[PDB]
Amino acid sequence: LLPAAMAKVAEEAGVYKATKHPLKTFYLAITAGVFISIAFVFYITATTGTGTMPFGMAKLVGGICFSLGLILCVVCGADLFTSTVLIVVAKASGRITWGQLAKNWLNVYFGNLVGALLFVLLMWLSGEYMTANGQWGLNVLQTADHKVHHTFIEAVCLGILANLMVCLAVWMSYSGRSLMDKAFIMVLPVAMFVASGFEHSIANMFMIPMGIVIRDFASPEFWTAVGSAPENFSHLTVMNFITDNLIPVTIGNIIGGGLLVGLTYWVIYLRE
Amino acid sequence: LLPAAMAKVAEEAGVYKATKHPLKTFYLAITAGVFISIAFVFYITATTGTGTMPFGMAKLVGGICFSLGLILCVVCGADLFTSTVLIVVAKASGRITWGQLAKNWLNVYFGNLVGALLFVLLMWLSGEYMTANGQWGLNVLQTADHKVHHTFIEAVCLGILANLMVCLAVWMSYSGRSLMDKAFIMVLPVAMFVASGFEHSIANMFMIPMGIVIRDFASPEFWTAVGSAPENFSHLTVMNFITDNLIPVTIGNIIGGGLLVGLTYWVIYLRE
Amino acid sequence: LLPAAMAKVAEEAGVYKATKHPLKTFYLAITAGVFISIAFVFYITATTGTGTMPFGMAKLVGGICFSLGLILCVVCGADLFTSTVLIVVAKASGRITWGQLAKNWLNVYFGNLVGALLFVLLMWLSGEYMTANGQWGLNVLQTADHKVHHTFIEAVCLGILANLMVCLAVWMSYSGRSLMDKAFIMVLPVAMFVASGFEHSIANMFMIPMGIVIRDFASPEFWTAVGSAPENFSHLTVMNFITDNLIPVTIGNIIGGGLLVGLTYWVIYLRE
Amino acid sequence: LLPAAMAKVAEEAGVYKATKHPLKTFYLAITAGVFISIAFVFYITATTGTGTMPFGMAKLVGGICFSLGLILCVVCGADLFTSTVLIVVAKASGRITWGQLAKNWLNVYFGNLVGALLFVLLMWLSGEYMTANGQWGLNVLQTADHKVHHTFIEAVCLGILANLMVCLAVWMSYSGRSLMDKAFIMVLPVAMFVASGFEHSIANMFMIPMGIVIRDFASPEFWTAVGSAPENFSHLTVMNFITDNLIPVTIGNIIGGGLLVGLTYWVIYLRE
Amino acid sequence: LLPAAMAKVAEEAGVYKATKHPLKTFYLAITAGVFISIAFVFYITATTGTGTMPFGMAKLVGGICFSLGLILCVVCGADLFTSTVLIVVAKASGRITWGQLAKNWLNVYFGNLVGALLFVLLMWLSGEYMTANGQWGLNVLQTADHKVHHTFIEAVCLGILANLMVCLAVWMSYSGRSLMDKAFIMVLPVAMFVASGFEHSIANMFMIPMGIVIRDFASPEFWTAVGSAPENFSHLTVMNFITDNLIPVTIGNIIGGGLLVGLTYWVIYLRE
């Protein structure tokens, strides 16, 4: 597709998604949350034990593994919060209403949260935090620990960049016609935002709660194996999650996805 | 293919499989079991001697080598037990009966068992357990050993995750139109389920019997080469396999493949 | 496409680019600068801590990661300065005048500058320079310092090489028709020009200003962690950048991209 | 292509191959042997100097490099002996006679042997055995040495496994319609058989004669370079090759390729 | 395309190239030489500092990097010498005369030499030999030194093997129709001949003269950094290059390209 055609199909997807039946949107958001949880589990598995490997190569491979979740979302038509920020193109064109925008945003947000929590529960019940002699759980705990130590502006900017990359991956997916065209065009754009450590709202909704669960309910054998204590991650709290991470990263995701990609492309190809 | 057409072709495949001749289904189940045995053998060869490599990269490469088996099943049209769980989509639409589904499931399960046992016999007769100064047999023994030390809930959840990933790979291949559309879209979902160590019934009924026979009839030279004894794998018995692994993993596979993918997508795209 | 058709579509791209509204070209140039800076951030991330890695393999991996930005430029229709030097094919045939080409070049250059500066600001606000205990900022500073120690002749020749490779990658994408035709054919040409350390104007006007910003506004904790001082990069000034690097590299880019690819292929396939 | 269409085109290819001109078949078999020797040369080049590297990664990369030769035979239409076992499908359908099967098999075998010997001569005259301070010749000698130490049952089973993998690589390439569809789908099945040490007749009639030639005619400088002696490979003999390796591996290839792939698919898709 | 259609399109390409205007052939030969020197610069950059990396993996990755030059030659239609040997198919069918083939070969040879020399000048004026602190120039010198120490028969056989691989890569690209089929089908055949150290005339035309330039005109700081002296490269002379390298390598290239690929396939698919 030509870029004007990509803008047109983006507008069509925006009007199509916002007018869907709300319960169908809720189930699709649940599946999208499960897909992002799957992608982050793959990222954690790939980066387990890579303390001796080069930092950049390990981050790049982990980001490549994380690209599976967005591929699943696009191919299966799941409703992902960061991917549905592009339906603001339809709002800017006047083809959907502000109320529809807000309702779809809230519905997809809640659905991704529910799916992420359900996959967190299923992930905990599988005993995966003890694989690699507990290095899996320690990897999750270290990932969730550094994600709550950022400032407000810093976290907002990381979210802006993360959803900018995600929305650029989704827009480049509109150009392709075949399955490989859509899938392979999102590998590098997603590996870019994951390897750089940009903050993703739905990914954080799986990582930080899973770290909290591991910290709260870890067996003594896990702490003996990893050589750590729960006192080392005392900042892994739900309130700290919402304050330090969730709100600024979600705001940054909204700003990035809406203003930087969708609105600029609507201005350039669709305002006239 | 769009997700609605994807659900439609999934319903078509579910109807087609249940209505095939029993002998054709049995033969294709045998071939699917052989394909999964081939994939896990490729995985074992790919993970030989990686005690020094990072855990994540080794598991990811081994999982990528495992994608060959599901690609073989999809391209050659063989009935894998986890893939035939997706005939529940046709069952939920009323196009097939409960008895047909049960007969097809039992036939495919028996065929998978026969194929896995035949490939176990072929692998034993080929002398492959002595590869890499016996490290191939060592890898087989340790892979089979940790598969029988999971609790019932843990094994059920691991099977749920494994068959969820496998059925997501199979469902996404419905979107593909050409050969490499189907092939390359399935590398990541299977590499994930292998790298994360999720328990798959069909791969288990190959490797756990493989490790059992290796432990039972290994030559003394192998034991001197590996620096081990049959005593350290004393729990690798057939009854231990059936109780600790086979039943919970099969139950988890059924639950995941049916409810999480098949019935969810039937509800979303085929309920009305 | 055959080479004659490739030259014809290059001609059409040259006239079509030179006839957009000036604001549209400015916006597309800004997005092109943002994409190239995304690619360069990916290059820094993928090559952080690769001091123990072989020089060539780390450079190649970073260059492959850098290919994301130019793929974004070609797929999304962004206006890159080194890619718009190919519109000289349209000028050589007389379908556009010298004034249109000069105005288009100035507009694209200024838009690229604005985009690179905005992305520099965004990456500074995110705190990315402290990644890997300051190794990310250290890699940024090392890359920026090495690029200002080239004399005029070597800088001009390196720009010639860089834009020759960029314009060859752009030219090869004209042959392809699908998205993966255009995507994969430009991975190796960009990876080779990044790995070999050729001087790209648009990449540099994001790289060096970011190094200047890091030098000026880094916290003393960063310097303590990296074991260096801001005095060790005293040559990273704006005027030194503009004189020793920007001007010769831009001149070399223009010469390479225009003469070596554009006018040469116009002579071969369009002069008769 | 669906599996029924794949079986149909397999039948058509089997009928076409058996009825071609004997001289054209001989020349195609010569080119196929040359292609297989090229693949094994690439394999040895890739796997030289990897004593310190993990067994799994080294074998997998060597197998990926081996994929080139099979793609050469498939795309160029060369007659590979293992691939021409699949023309037994035509025999089972009665569309060709037993004598046609025997004549085609003998012609392709002789042509493959002639091509392998010609490439052995060309590789010996090129002085490639001294690459990397003699590590190339040492790799050839060591890999050839271990291939003649297998018992008859081991050789038969290894040939069965190898040619099964090769014939499944060929069979799924029937599904593909594009050149790269046939190419990439065959990389994993060939890499699986190479990495797992499975025994291929055509590859062996190149390697073992190459090892014999290297042992017999190497200069003493090569021997001092490798730190070994020709006495260390006393079992690399022509008679030992023919007895312990060629006959059983060929028997295993015939049995596997005929019964397990061709006849199985004929039973499933062609008997009715 | 089928092998018969591939031979037909090879004949068409041979007829078309021989009947082009001499100046167009000269310009395309210059661009082809530039492309091949681009490939060799990529190969040198990728393999810089891989003295600790295994020999096989380093050579294979370098061959992956070298495949860029052939992609440029096939996609952009440039006249590269070993590729233009395949016009012997047209001569064998009688569609072109001996004189046309002779002038075409001479023109392509001279243009390739001119392009390689101009690009040697471009890289020497860029200071690339100082990359990686003298390791880039040292790598070029080491690559150039080993190529001029091969015997006449060894050089002829290396050229034969190299040109066989190039003509198989080109002849395999005829089947592919879009850009990505042609591009990807050539990476492995080129990586095979580059990793194995086979001798390519046009590649040597850039390699050895570049090493001569580095030896003659390098600053003494280069010699102190690399810890070597120009006395260690006394055999790197222009006359030495032409005698020991250029003539036998070109003879082997012609023999390979003519007899092995072009004439054999003409006999198989076009004589009768």
Numbering used by the authors:
A (entry chain B), B (entry chain C), C (entry chain A), D (entry chain D), E (entry chain E): 10 to 281
Question: What does the original paper state about this entry?
Answer:
FocA belongs to the widespread, evolutionarily ancient formate-nitrite transporter (FNT) family of pentameric anion channels and translocates formic acid bidirectionally. Central to the FNT family’s function are conserved histidine and threonine residues (H209 and T91 in E. coli FocA), both of which are essential for pH-dependent formate:H+ symport into fermenting E. coli cells. Here, we show the high-resolution structure of native E. coli FocA, together with the H209N variant, and describe the dynamic pore features that couple to the protonation state.
To identify if the FocA pentamer is inherently asymmetric and the observed flexibility at its cytoplasmic side is confined in the protomer, we further analyzed the cryo-EM data for native FocA without imposing any symmetry. The model reached a resolution of 2.87 Å (FSC = 0.143), with local resolution ranging from 2.7 to 3.1 Å. This calculation unambiguously confirms the 3D variability of the symmetric pentamer and shows that individual protomers have different degrees of resolvability for all regions identified to be of higher flexibility by the 3D variability analysis. The findings from the 3D variability analysis (A) were recapitulated within the asymmetric reconstruction, but regions with elevated flexibility exhibited asymmetric behavior. The N-terminal helix is clearly outlined at high resolution (1) but appears discontinuous in some regions (1′). Similar asymmetry is observed in region D98-L110 ((2) vs. (2′)) and the periplasmic region A227-L245 ((3) vs. (3′)). However, it will be important to investigate in future studies how this asymmetry is influenced by the membrane environment. Such asymmetry can have various implications, which may include: (a) protomers working independently of each other in formate/formic acid translocation, as hypothesized previously; (b) allosteric communication due to distinct thermal fluctuations of side chains that may reach several kcal mol‒1 of entropic contributions; (c) modulating protein-protein interactions via conformational selection mechanisms.
